[PDB]
Symmetry: D2
Subunit: 318 residues, 4 copies
């Protein structure tokens, strides 16, 4: 069989995942959502596009988890976004029940899948999805860091006037105030950003502003669109993860991953650089922090611990 990718959620990110998976000839695609219509429509629309570039891929839409059977990769975008007038607790409340339903469908019908979560709040939902589904911890990851890395690379490539291919961004942690950037492990052509300031290729103030722009990057897009959130960069980010699994590329990508003692952490999903191959999360790359970074990381992990406490307070199973 060709590889099979199931997409749980057929909204703007889901649709974009499905389109990218066709264009990149990754395999056959099933779009799932709770109500018939949109999944089947988007599937057929992309199927109908396929003769133009010449990709051969089966597309279907479904509202029964049986349709995801034997999926090699599952990408989860199901759930609601954070509104103008709802608490973290009500978001967690609604989206945890979504994760329970999703996790039970994956458990029954695609237990060998590599699962990529992109439901918010990410570090909590992926932890929950793994627990609900029972899948091996190395087979469930969250997409976050690749997106922050992609935005920071864009800003850096702009600032230096160089190709996006020759910029590297090193981030850990989560988004926003929970992001932990290491500008010393971010580079142009191998030269750290910290050294580029010393060369006069940029300034400290410009560098700090790009880091802050990365922190704020999701909101920046929300403020422009007014309705809805980013979807092109989030979808490309998750597809990079999926492709590394499917093609056993062993990319090193910052992802929310289950820590078994790496970074001094046990039993939590945290944004860290991981090797993704055909066996899932194969290795975590644990860097050595300076003081500012250790303090930033600890703050960010405390934020995650806070979220998990809130999940547990609203769900017996967790």
């Amino acid at each position: 069989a060709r590889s099979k990718i199931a997409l749980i959620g057929a909204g703007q990110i889901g649709g974009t995942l499905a389109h990218l998976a066709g264009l990149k000839e990754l395999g056959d695609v099933v779009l799932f959502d709770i109500v018939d219509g949109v999944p089947q429509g988007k599937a057929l629309d992309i199927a109908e596009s396929a003769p133009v570039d010449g990709f051969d891929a089966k597309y279907s839409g479904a509202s029964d988890y049986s349709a995801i059977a034997g999926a090699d990769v599952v990408i989860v975008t199901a759930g609601v976004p954070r509104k103008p007038g709802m608490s973290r607790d009500d978001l967690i409340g609604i989206n945890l029940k979504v994760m329970e339903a999703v996790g039970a469908g994956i458990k029954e019908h695609a237990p060998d899948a590599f699962v990529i979560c992109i439901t918010n709040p990410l570090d909590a939902m992926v932890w929950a999805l793994q627990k609900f589904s029972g899948l091996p911890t190395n087979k469930v990851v969250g997409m976050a860091g690749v997106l922050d890395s992609a935005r920071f690379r864009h800003f850096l490539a702009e600032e230096f006037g160089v190709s996006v291919e020759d910029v590297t961004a090193f981030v850990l942690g989560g988004h926003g105030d929970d992001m932990v950037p290491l500008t010393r492990y971010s580079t142009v052509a191998g030269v750290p950003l910290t050294d580029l300031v010393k060369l006069g290729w940029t300034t400290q103030e410009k560098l700090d502003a790009m880091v802050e722009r990365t922190r704020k990057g999701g909101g920046e897009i929300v403020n422009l669109l007014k309705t809805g959130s980013a979807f092109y960069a989030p979808a490309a980010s998750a597809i990079a993860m999926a492709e590394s699994y499917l093609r056993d590329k062993k990319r090193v990508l910052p992802c929310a991953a289950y820590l078994d003692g790496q970074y001094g952490i046990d039993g939590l999903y945290v944004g860290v650089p991981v090797v993704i191959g055909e066996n899932g999360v194969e290795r975590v790359l644990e860097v050595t922090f300076n003081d500012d970074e250790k303090a930033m990381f600890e703050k960010s992990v405390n934020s995650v611990k806070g979220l998990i406490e809130a999940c547990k307070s609203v769900n017996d199973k967790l």
Copy 2:
């Protein structure tokens, strides 16, 4: 300079055009729409995706036509869709004024552009846009037939269980009842569909049903999505046209094109197979019809004439 593609309309088709143009490294992209926000948001979101695959392209959003200056290709999706409760005349009424505004921006700021129209009703709006803009008739085309061809190829590839790469669909005219398919010039690996029925690879009833499904294909997607229309296949179709221009590929593509006496028609835009290269519409391929086809084509051109009469009745300039 890299090539410059301006996209007039930043809705679902526009966004998908912009994403495809990046992925295919066609050049820099300007998204235009009447109100700031969405164009700039989608532009930045796609820009931010770019480091993941490594495409180098400038993206921007704008609400001033000055931003399209010197565009090599302009793709127009501006305007409103046909509603549940509005007449052809009110659609034409609203969208003609859109074409006047668009045509004046192209005239002033990208007079050398190759222009691809995807505002409805297509055969009328492209005719109008050319008239309003004053651009050479060979430099303004409408996207329609490639989309019908793509849907019919999908259905055929399904039916025969063969690659989408080895199916060819021949269509002329417009969509729906105005489509003029030639199943005898549609093939699998060079073998006409009419001969595949004789071989027993399909049946006449199945073939007729695929032709009818192609006619109904846009509505099929609308019925599934419930809100909004197809956008992946329409965007891929227009990008194939744009790429043929930009790369001087000389693809032979069914497009709404200005006829200077080909097919016995003068002064109308009609869906015909055209060679698209760096000089725009370079040649029209005028096939020889059988009787059923000639009658179908004449009906379809009468429908176009009807539309143009309606345009003229609601606009002095036309």
Copy 3:
């Protein structure tokens, strides 16, 4: 595991196969040849290229068949070319012994492979390789027709001044005088070549000359190079076949395939259009001939029968 492609023969076609397989991210590659050195050198050179486009593929060279173990696809270019001063019988003599050795390595170490033969004379060597290896007849094919089709498409695209993407060539049989072209099933945008002559897009004499140029096409390249034969088009042709297998594309490609009664032939490999998918040769497309074509096909199959008789006369096992 990633897919595994073994290439038996590390000459110019083999090297080009290996390069294409990397660029197209088809999987890991083993280059085999009888003497160490060249396979390992070409493998390492391509491996070393890989960081430039970013393909992840393992490359190795070997002179032991154990190295091909579990290959998903095997492509055979081993053997000698026809010289200025050697008979068909001495070519067959030398290359049959090559096929025996190759077939025994495939039998032992990659019995589930899809095997693509490109040792001359093609219709005989593939028949022999299948017999020596014992693999299922649907899992062993010869590359020939795709190459003739590719050359004829190039000539046609030149003549009409249109994209190579919009030309289809229909050929059966073998090369040279054994080729059986059907110009009526060859098209530009679905319009048969026979109809393009009637439209004045070309002439009968030009069409006949392109058919003859296709027949002579391998020699044309030999006359220019002076040492050695074509290798880019032959390698691209075989990779199209391999990709259809690996990605289950179900391309319809003219290939030397084992006939179980199709075209009225039993027990011979003949150039025919076949559906290639994950199960190998899945279906043969048997067209209906006109008189000239039936006579051409019968002549061409008699030529194949002649070759097989010659093989049998020089090998007990056959």
Copy 4:
């Protein structure tokens, strides 16, 4: 017009350049060499391959410089390789006269070209070609460092078991003993190699061995092939440079480039990281050396000075 790439030399690197340029749809290709036959044969063979992937590109072969007229990029591989029994002086002697002839053809017929030299010894031949041709110094570069970088990235990706996409190698200078690697500016996912030794991901001895393997890398391939030198990695390397020019990507690539005082050097071609865009060499990235590196760089520039002295001693014009 499509972009035009002229390839001066139709040997194994030239052929591979031509194939890559087609596959990557960079433009039309002219293969030049001194004797008719091989250029025209390889051109036609690649042209004939093109329908298989669907690239539209004109290919031709020529032995008159008029055929390169208006080339946007010229890639020079003409000349002889260093033999088992010839001196540096006889190599320089023969290949300087080649550069004079090439430079005069470029001067007359493609004076606006971006020129990429890959004739040995590289740092001298590119300096000579620029002088003979009279083209702007920012429009003539040599391919060397990208190749060393590509080989070192391959070795590193092997050693760490990670994707080639996530490794960066920083080299300056020339090949062999004249290479100046900076392992501290070489990274996996932004983490310097020096830090990966501290993490235990590799060892110092392994790192040193990969650096030495990079130095010896061209000879390693020569020892395996026995006849001829590497060609896949050299061709991919030069195409990356050409693509950055053609698509205005502003890649940062180590290339032999004319120094106007950067790195403390005036009037010499030296391997340094340069920004390549539509204006040629746009900026040199001048890093800050530690002591070991400064001494290595000075040794390597003294070697270049030695070569240039030898050129001047055998040519009045220089």
